[PDB]
Amino acid sequence: MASPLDQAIGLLIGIFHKYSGKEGDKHTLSKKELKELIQKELTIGSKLQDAEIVKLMDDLDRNKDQEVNFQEYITFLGALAMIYNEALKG
Template identity: 50%
Template sequence: MSQVQQSMALLISAFHKYSGKEGDKTTLSKGELKDLLNAELGDVMGKNTDQAKVDKIFKDLDANADGSVDFQEYVTLVACLTMMCNEFFTKK
């Protein structure tokens, strides 16, 4: 697989590692999202121990306001973080 294909597979794998622990396998609950953020993105976003901060991130990600974060909403977060990292590293 190419590097891009490997990256896509890792994104999918990371989502499904956390989704479904509290119910629906195709979405992330607030608790599942918190676990994913801390374990997979803690170095970029910082550890999210403040529940109000997690609530805000969850609300911002839940674009369709259905009370869960689906794969598209998760990928939007990763894409935005990737763009921010790219800007940071290309400015150095």
């Protein structure tokens, strides 16, 4: 069955594809799409703590002139998650 994990994975995939879809090689996307993704799909406004700020900055270096793939996109979210849910860093 589409258990909570599979569903949540499904969400992260769907979120990816929502932008990556347009890039043709929709297994990848870049800087612009990443900034869009975070800014649009995280309706935060109040730039939480540091994590998201650092993601937005980092994005420029992380990409520079290269597309990122799915897992490297996920890493953006996982890093975000770790930095603001400080707990996860132990």
